[PDB]
Amino acid sequence: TSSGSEGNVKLCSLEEAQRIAEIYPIMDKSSRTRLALIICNEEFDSIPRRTGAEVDITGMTMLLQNLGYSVDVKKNLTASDMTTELEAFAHRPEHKTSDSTFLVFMSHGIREGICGKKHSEQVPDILQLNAIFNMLNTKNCPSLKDKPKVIIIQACRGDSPGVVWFKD
């Protein structure tokens, strides 16, 4: 049933879990404090409005909660604000009593990275994927040492259609 905390996520039965040395350890459900962060930019100064972004926010928020994560949702941030938010997320004490984390980024994007709210061609406002890794690594986030860190990014990575033609 979809009435439970896991919603529309298909459950893993006890028999299936026993069927599954090479797996990341899962902390006790009763005491663990899983955290997830969604950063979504919808309204921009110079780039068109990202219509439908709210559907993405709703969908990802509910899914991550279904999977057991407490979800923080931050909207319409500059690359500087995104950096500050990531730094704060890395400092959260809940990670110590967590076994994993999810980070979701949704915005306009270019080849170099993810667009902040103030982005324009004249004055770039970009957050690089490299910066995300650095802020969440063992040096800057020791609490997530040995724990899976999943980064999801919705954004263009350039202007090309990503296709080529071929004949049969």
Binding site: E6, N8, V9, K10, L11, C12, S13, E16, A17, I20, E22, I23, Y24, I26, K29, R50, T51, G52, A53, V55, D56, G59, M60, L63, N66, L67, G68, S100, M106, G109, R111, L129, I132, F133, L136, N137, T138, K139, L144, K145, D146, K147, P148, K149, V150, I151, I152, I153, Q154, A155, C156, R157, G158, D159, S160, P161, G162, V163
Partner: protein, 88 residues
């Protein structure tokens, strides 16, 4: 006593398209990649590790239409399989 640890480990990134290339978003239905990811997570989190789920998402994009994209898994340092074990 102090011990050494890898500075970067246990990461997986999943991007909506390949480098240089666009990602699509429906005005009312939302981003295609996001919607597709949720559906696959709901279906396969019980039985598949995150890497395998991401591969399945990729496979679902294989046949290109007028709005094509190929999600890319990036910078992977997962040393183990990450199973979500939904319900536990």
């Amino acid at each position: 006593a102090i011990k050494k640890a890898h500075i970067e480990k246990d990461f997986i990134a999943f991007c909506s398209s390949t480098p240089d290339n666009v990602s699509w978003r429906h005005p009312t239905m939302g981003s295609v990649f996001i919607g597709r990811l949720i559906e696959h997570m709901q279906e396969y989190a019980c039985s598949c590790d995150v890497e395998e789920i991401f591969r399945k998402v990729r496979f679902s994009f294989e046949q290109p239409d007028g709005r094509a994209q190929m999600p890319t898994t990036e910078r992977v340092t997962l040393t183990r399989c990450f199973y979500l074990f939904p319900g536990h």
